[PDB]
Amino acid sequence: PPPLIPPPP
Amino acid sequence: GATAVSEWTEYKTADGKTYYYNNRTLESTWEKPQELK
């Protein structure tokens, strides 16, 4: 199952 | 020598996005990284 990405600042 | 920043795999999300999974230090990236050109 894929991870969600964290957003860049 | 120096430990280059790289190690970029392919992680496909359900929306059909080609995102990268940093194996460098265990990180995620949506599109192309800095050194990955």
Q: Find the domain containing B3 and state its range.
A: 1-37
Number of domains, chain B: 1
The CATH number assigned to the domain holding B20 equals 2.20.70
List all residues 6 or more positions away from B19 whose beta carbon is below 8 Å from its beta carbon. Answer: A5, B11, B12, B13, B28, B29, B30, B31
List all residues 6 or more positions away from B3 whose beta carbon is below 8 Å from its beta carbon. Answer: none
Experimentally determined by: NMR
Top residue of B22, B30, B32, B34 to mutate, by most chain A CBs within 10 Å, is B30
Rounded to whole angstroms, how far apart are CA atoms B28 and B33? 10
Question: Burial code of B1-35, b = ≥16 C-beta within 10 A, e = fewer?
Answer: eeeeeeebeebeeeeeeebbbbeeeeeebeeebee
Rounded to whole angstroms, how far apart are CA atoms A4 and B30? 10
Interchain contact A9–B (C-beta under 8 A): no
Q: Is B29 in contact with B22 (CB distance < 8 Å)?
A: yes
